[PDB]
């Protein structure tokens, strides 16, 4: 069998764009590790992708992952867009590069490393780990130490 890991992720951003951060919690058989980092100018959606990326890339071997996230953007990309993109060479119907392609590709690579079951939570309430990653993400956004170098500035 694969070892089963629970992952909880969240992103947070003070503007659109603005300072932001991600938070993530990995749990194996009741033992936890946390990840977070803050970026000077990013978007909420990029931070939500980053949280999942960092969490998945931290795994040292193939695992079964229960990945819990409140992110509608990540949900929408995983369920609706990723399949099309891999078929179209990561281009829109219009033949241009998809928004946040750097991170989606990186997430797709990390996803192919493991057996992933997604649990789409509807809020932070009653989800103490998801509430904790929000706190980690907000805390990171209030102390940003890195640049989101892949963010193509739109304003």
């Amino acid at each position: 069998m694969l070892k089963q890991v629970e992952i909880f992720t969240d992103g947070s951003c003070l503007g659109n764009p603005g300072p932001g951060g991600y938070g993530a919690i990995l749990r194996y058989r009741g033992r936890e590790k946390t990840f977070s980092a803050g970026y000077t100018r990013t978007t909420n959606n990029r931070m939500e992708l980053m949280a999942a990326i960092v969490a998945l890339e931290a795994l040292k071997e193939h695992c079964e992952v229960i990945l819990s996230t409140d992110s509608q953007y990540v949900r929408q990309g995983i369920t609706q867009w990723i399949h099309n993109w891999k078929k179209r060479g990561w281009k829109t119907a219009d033949k241009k590069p998809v928004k946040n392609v750097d991170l989606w590709q990186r997430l797709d690579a990390a996803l192919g490393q493991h057996q992933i079951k997604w649990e789409w939570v509807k809020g932070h309430a009653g989800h103490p780990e998801n509430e904790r990653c929000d706190e980690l993400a907000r805390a990171a956004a209030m102390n940003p130490t890195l640049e989101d170098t892949g963010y193509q500035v739109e304003v």
Partner: peptide, 4 residues
């Protein structure tokens, strides 16, 4: 044994 912990995979992270």
């Amino acid at each position: 044994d912990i995979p992270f």
